[model samples]
Target: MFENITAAPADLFGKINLGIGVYKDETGKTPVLTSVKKAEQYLLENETTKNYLGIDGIPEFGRCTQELLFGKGSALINDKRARTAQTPGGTGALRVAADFLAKNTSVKRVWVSNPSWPNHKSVFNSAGLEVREYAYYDAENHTLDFDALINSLNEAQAGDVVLFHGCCHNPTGIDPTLEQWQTLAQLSVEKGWLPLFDFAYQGFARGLEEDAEGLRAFAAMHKELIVASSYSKNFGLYNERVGACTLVAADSETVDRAFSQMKAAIRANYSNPPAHGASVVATILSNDALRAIWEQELTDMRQRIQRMRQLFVNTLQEKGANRDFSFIIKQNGMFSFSGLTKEQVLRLREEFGVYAVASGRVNVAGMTPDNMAPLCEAIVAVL
Candidate 1:
C-alpha cells in the first residue's frame, strides 16, 4: 500500500495559481518586509554568537509571543500563567502540542473544523492521536454553520483536544464573533474539552488586538488552553520557520510544569528551534521604531488582501457572474472558498490557465490589480 501511494501534484508553478497561502503584493511577489530586513541588518551588526538556542528558544521571543497574543498587561502575562516554546513554524508548534498531549496527557483525539487546513488532521494522526472533524463551513451558503458547529463540538468530551483557528480561519476565512467565542469558551468549561488555538494569521483578519479577542475569551474563561502561533505571514518569515507554542494554565506553577513537558517534547523532536527567525521576531518586536514599521507593513498587507477580495467580487459582478460573490468580501484573511464547483474549478484551469484548489479555495493574496480582470473573466466564463 505504501509503495502504491503517489505524491500529490504541485500547485506552485501554475500560470495564475491562487492556491498558495502567502502574501503577494500588487507586483505579484511576496517581498520581504522592510522591518524584517532592518532586523536582519541589526542582527548582522550587533549579534555575536551562533550557539544553540535552548529547547524553548530565545527567552525574549517567548515573552514577545505572549505579549502579542494576550497583550502586555493582560493577567495571563502579568501573573506568569502563560509559557511559550518556540518551534520551527506554526506547523511545528502544532506538532509539538500534539506530541505533548499524546505523551503527557490522556488526550486521545483531536477535533478540527471539517474544512480546516488539511494538515491539521495529518499532524494529529501522525502523533498517534485520533482526528475527528467538527462541522464548520456550510459549503452551499459559503458561511459558517454555527449551530452545526456547536452541535458537533457538543460531542467532544474531556480528554479531547479541540483545535480552533484563532483568527482568519483557514481555507474558509470565517471566524466566530466575540459573543460566539464566549459561548464556545463556556461550552468548553462545561464539556471539559481542552482548547488549542492555531493562530497562524494574527494580523491578517483584523488589527492585531482585535483579531485576538476570540482566543482571549478562552484564555479568560478556561483554566488551561494551548495556542500555536506563526510569524510566517505577518512577518514574512515563511522560510525561517518561526513560531511559538504557548501553554496557559490555572496558575504560574502549573504553567511552568506544563512548559517543562513541552520543552522535553521539543528536545526529542527538533532538539531546538532555528535561531535567525526567532531572533528577527524578538528584535523587531522589542525595538520601538522597528515595531512601528512592522505594524504598518502588516496593516498594509492586510488592507491589500482585503482590497483584492473586494476587487475579486466586484470584477466578477462586472463580468456578469451569475451569482452573489458578496460573501467573498465579508471573509477575512488570505483565503476564500470561491464557491466554484469542482467541475467549474477544473474548467478555470483547463480553459483559462487560471488555477485554484479543486476544493474551490482561492488565495486572495495571490491576486493583483493586473490579474483581477482576467481572473474574474475566467471565473465568469466557467460559471
Candidate 2:
C-alpha cells in the first residue's frame, strides 16, 4: 500500500504539539457552564433513582430534544409523526440512525460534504452504508461552493440519505444562506432524496432558533427526514453525553413503525440510555426557569465565539496578511477553515508551536485572547 491509515483529524493534530483546545477560556481552561452546574446540582440534590430508561429512552427527554432541534411551535412537533430517541451523544445518535436506516430503509448510500467531519464517513461505514461526498466548502475562494453543492445534490440517488450540518458546520463553518437553504429544501423534494441533519452545535451559531432555520425548512419540505442533535456544546454537558436521534415520519403509521424499529436498534446497542444527562436536560427544558438560564448561557457561548472569530480575523489583517483573510470572519461557530496549506499548517505546528489540523481547520472557540497574536504572527510567517 502507498499510504498508512490511522484514526482521524484530532489524532492527526495530536501527532504534533497542540496549542489551544475547544470549549475553554483563552487560558486553556474549560470550566463547566454555571447553568450546567445548576442542572447537575439539581440532579444531585433532588433527583431520585438511576434506573435504566426504556429502550425508547426518557419520555419527556424525547419531547424536549425534539422541540429543541425542530422548535417549540414547529408543525413537525405537533404533527404526531415525529419520533425522537435519547442516545449517548451526538455521534452516538448518528450511529444509531445510520444503523436503523441501513437495516429498515432501502437507503444504500449516504452523501456528505466533501470536507466533512472526519468521523462521519467512518460512522456511516460502520453502519454498513456506503459513503460518498459532495463538494461544499470552496478552499480556493474560501466560501460555500453553491454551484458545486447543487450539482452534487442533483446527482444523488432518489432514496439515499443526504447529510447536512444543522448548524456550525464542522471542519469548515461555511453554511448555506437562507435562500440557498430554501433551494436545498426544494431540491430534496424534487430529487426525492432523504435529508439527514447532524446538529451538534445548536446555539453556537447565530442563536438557538436562527441556527435551526435550515433544519426546520428541511423538515417542513420533506415528510421523511432524520436528525441527530447534540447538547454537548450548547449545554456544556460534554462528559454527560446528551444527544437525541429523531425521525420525521411521513405519517402516524410510519412514525409507529420507525419508532419501534429504532427502539429495537437501541435495545441491541446499549439496552437503554443513562439517566443522568437526559434527566438533567429534561428537567431544565421542562422548567421555564432553568431553561431560561440555559438559553442565556448558550447565548453567551455563541457571542463569545463570534467575538473570537472577528478578533482572529482582525488580528490577521492588522498583522498585514499577504492574502485576504477576511473569509475567516464570515465563517461561524467553533471552527474556521483558515485556508492554510498543509505545508503552512506543518510550519505552524513544527516551527511556531501552534497546533492546527493539516487541513487548516482551526477551532476559533479554542483561541484565547492571548493566543490571537501568536496565531496571527504565525499565520503571517507561513503565508
Each prediction's Cα lDDT score?
0.92, 0.84
Q: For residues 263-358, write the lDDT of model 2, one tens digit per residue.
A: 898888888887788888898899889989888988877888888888987888888786777787788788877878889988888787788777
lDDT (10s digit) by residue, model 1, range 65-102? 99999987999998899999999999999999999999
User: Which stretches of model 2 miss by more than 4 angstroms?
Assistant: 1-21
Best by lDDT: 1
Worst ten-residue run, lDDT, model 2?
12-21
Residue pairs with backbone overlap in model 1: 88-241
Q: Which candidate is the best by TM-score?
A: 1
Clashing pairs in 2: 26-368
TM-score of 2: 0.94
Number of clashes found in candidate 2:
1
Q: TM-score of predicted model 1?
A: 0.97
Worst 10 residues of 1 by lDDT: 8-17
- What value does the lDDT take at residue 294 in candidate 1? 99
